[PDB]
Amino acid sequence: VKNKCVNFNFNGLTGTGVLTKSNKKFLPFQQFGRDIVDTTDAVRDPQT
Amino acid sequence: LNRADYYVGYLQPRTFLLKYNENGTITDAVDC
């Protein structure tokens, strides 16, 4: 479910955040996405 | 079998600085 504040537990990454569609360019071997200040930014859905 | 290769190198613990493109490709690296 998207477009709502939802408690996620993606593959062991517990947290609370709004989830939506994005236009990243995740390469085939990539799973996580982080920033310069090292915060988990974009997560490739394991079953999507 | 048949009827300009073998470039072997050893790795060591080094700090590297890598430049990531806007697409996640590693376009450059500089040793430290």
Partner: peptide, 24 residues
């Protein structure tokens, strides 16, 4: 057989350390 000539690596031999997508 083989030879043991020596060359330079230059800017070479660099793989992705972890699996984190990164941009800019």
């Amino acid at each position: 057989t083989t030879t043991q000539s020596y060359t330079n690596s230059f800017t070479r031999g660099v793989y992705y350390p972890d699996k984190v997508f990164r941009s800019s």
